[PDB]
Design a protein around this ligand. Structure first.
Ligand code: ME8
Ligand code: MG
Ligand code: ZN
Length: 530
């Protein structure tokens, strides 16, 4: 029996409201989850909120709100945001969950029993905003928001602070050779490749050990206690990273109460097929996480996808900078599925780029309306599809066969890209075929064939409708609502919208009735900017 397809988003710090960055990483995971459901597999995808630590506690304090009231309120903003974006998540975790906290304590004890924890002292730089320890070569003299010179993080630009503190330490230095061997033996363990190489270069340079506790006072008593030593709290990142494992073990009851299995095998999710993260948290997921998993004797992730940043004026859209627009209001201004298409199509995982209304509308107008939407209207037009059904095809021409060949070859290309994963190129391939379907429809001028050559019109519509079906099927993960509207317009049976048996030309039975579209009605309304 196949493993359940398991993918995760980062768990987001609840220091402020969700923005387009969290909607983006959560979308990637939702798309992958949805494609594997469409393919016919068992799927479990999760997201959630990272609620402990100094960064969050200080955010709460700033609002004059208890951290539990604050984390609950702000966590709810993430849950509601994702519901508004019509994601199909299986599980939404909070690190304040009693099941998770106990799990993290059990993991602590496993790492201790292994001999990988000792008591020591951290004396060095810390970035509170990133909850990150920084070595001497990862800080630079800079300036803060008030013009006062200071040290800053070379990771994030944030102000760093000097910490001298008794901390429990994890023996990360001891995993150097084991990490290097994993990276080299699993050449697609981290994507894109240049980030894999960055991780290798870093690990080859040498690792220091890592502080995995803080004194409880330093985190304002808002972290999981170290089991057996309540003077210390567990480092927010050790707690947070193991959310994925808690997720792998979680059963959700009828009344929403959650329980953990004692190990991962029965639920059959672990390890993740894909962890999706921003490059901001690469070291945590590519260096610390596999080392923790090695200590704990758990299987390592198949693949880490670490992507770039959506920017504004070339600066990362960031909760800590306040340069974020409301992502749901944006989705509602321009269309939810149109936004989803734009995020997935405009971006590759290597590059940063500014969110642009102009670029988003250009794709909505030029691809979604002018290609996909146009194609749907053509296939269902009462004056073209006179009988409002899938016609029987007659003999195929060489031109027909060439198009049909592209249809049959699409699934291979799209399935391969969805599994890399490379969602941008999946969409480019789907739209390549959609542009051909439209050029095919124009070349065959079906409005002229009507009541003139019924046989031929039958072949042209059948081929086009099948092509439209196949392309739409593979767009269901990115635009699930519009894809369903299209499938419904065509009268495509529910059983024919999903399953690998439907990955080839010639599925729908001629005679099948289409629902069609109403008079002035379009799938994608075009937008003009001021
Ligand atoms: C066990 S995981 C713990 C994670 C930790 N709690 C944390 O880092 O949480 P966080 O609230 O700072 O969210 C950071 C994440 O949100 C996305 N993201 C944020 N801004 C983005 C942007 N401008 N563009 C693209 N993606 C962005 C991207 O996925 C980035 O890695
Ligand atoms: Mg961040
Ligand atoms: Zn707690």
């Amino acid at each position: 029996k196949q493993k359940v397809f398991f993918a995760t988003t980062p768990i987001y710090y609840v220091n402020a409201s969700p923005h387009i960055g969290h909607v983006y990483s959560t979308l990637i995971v939702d798309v992958l989850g949805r494609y594997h459901r469409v393919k016919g597999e068992e799927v479990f995808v999760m997201t959630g909120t990272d609620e402990h630590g100094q960064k969050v506690a200080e955010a709460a304090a700033k609002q004059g709100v208890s951290p539990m009231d604050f984390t609950t309120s702000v966590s709810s903003e993430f849950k509601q945001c994702f519901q508004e974006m019509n994601y199909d998540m299986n599980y939404f975790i909070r690190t304040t969950n009693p099941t998770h906290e106990k799990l993290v304590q059990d993991i602590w004890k496993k790492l201790a029993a292994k001999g990988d924890i000792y008591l020591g002292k951290y004396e060095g730089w810390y970035s509170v905003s990133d909850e990150s320890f920084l070595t001497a070569q990862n800080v630079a003299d800079g300036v803060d928001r008030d013009g006062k010179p200071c040290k800053v993080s070379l990771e994030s630009g944030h102000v760093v602070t000097w910490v001298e503190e008794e901390n429990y330490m994890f023996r990360l230095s001891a995993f150097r050779e084991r990490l290097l061997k994993y990276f080299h033996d699993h050449p697609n363990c981290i994507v894109p490749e240049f980030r894999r190489r960055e991780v290798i270069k870093t690990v080859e340079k040498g690792l220091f050990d890592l502080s995995i506790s803080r004194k409880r006072e330093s985190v304002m008593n808002w972290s999981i206690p170290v089991p057996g030593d309540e003077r210390h709290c567990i480092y927010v990142w050790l707690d947070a990273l193991f959310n994925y494992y808690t997720g792998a073990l979680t059963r959700v009851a009828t009344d929403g109460t959650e329980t953990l299995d004692e190990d991962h095998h029965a639920l059959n999710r672990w390890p993740a097929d894909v962890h999706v993260v921003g490059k901001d948290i690469l070291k945590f997921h590519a260096i610390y996480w596999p080392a923790f998993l090695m200590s704990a004797e758990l299987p390592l992730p198949e693949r880490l996808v670490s992507h770039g940043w959506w920017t504004k004026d070339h600066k990362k859209i960031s909760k800590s900078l306040g340069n974020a627009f409301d992502p749901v209001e944006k989705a509602k201004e321009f269309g939810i599925d149109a936004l989803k298409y734009f995020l997935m199509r405009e971006s590759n995982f290597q590059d940063d780029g500014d969110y642009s209304d102009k670029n988003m509308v250009a794709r909505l107008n030029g691809e979604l309306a002018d290609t996909l939407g146009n194609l749907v209207s053509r296939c269902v037009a009462p004056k073209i599809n006179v009988n409002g059904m899938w016609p029987e095809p007659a003999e195929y021409s060489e031109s027909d066969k060439t198009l049909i060949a592209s249809l049959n070859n699409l699934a291979g290309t799209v399935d391969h890209y969805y599994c890399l994963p490379d969602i941008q190129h999946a969409l480019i391939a789907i739209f390549d075929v959609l542009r051909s379907l439209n050029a095919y429809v124009t070349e065959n001028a079906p409005w002229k064939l009507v009541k003139m050559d019924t046989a031929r019109l039958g072949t042209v519509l059948y081929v086009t409708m099948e092509g439209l079906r196949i392309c739409t099927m593979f767009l269901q993960p990115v635009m699930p609502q519009k894809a369903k509207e299209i499938m419904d317009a065509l009268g495509v049976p529910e059983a024919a919208r999903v399953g690998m048996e439907n990955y080839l030309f010639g599925i729908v039975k001629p005679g099948t009735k289409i629902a069609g579209l109403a008079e002035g009605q379009v799938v994608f309304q075009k937008v003009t900017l001021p």
